Amino acid sequence: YAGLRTPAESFGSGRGQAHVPKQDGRARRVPQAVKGRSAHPPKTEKDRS
């Protein structure tokens, strides 16, 4: 759940900004956003044997 604990929403078109989910004026959740989720991180379910 790292990076997913936020209700961040995107503003969409109209305000001259990229459609990136924001919360309190900060970009959140998405992998390209600082403090966002990790796109393809190490996974516990992976069989390492």
Q: Which residues bind Sr ion (CB under 5 A)?
A: 13
Q: CB of residue 12 vs Na ion: minimum separation in angstroms?
A: 15
Per-residue mark of binding to RNA, 1-40 (x: CB under 7 A): -----------xxx-xxxxx-x--xxx---xxxxxx-xxx
Q: What are phi and psi of 23, to 5 degrees?
A: -145, 125
Q: What is the DSSP letter of 43?
A: -
Amino acid at residue number 26: R
* Interaction between residue 45 and RNA (CB under 7 A): yes
* Interaction between residue 26 and Na ion (CB under 5 A): no
d(CA 6, CA 28): 7
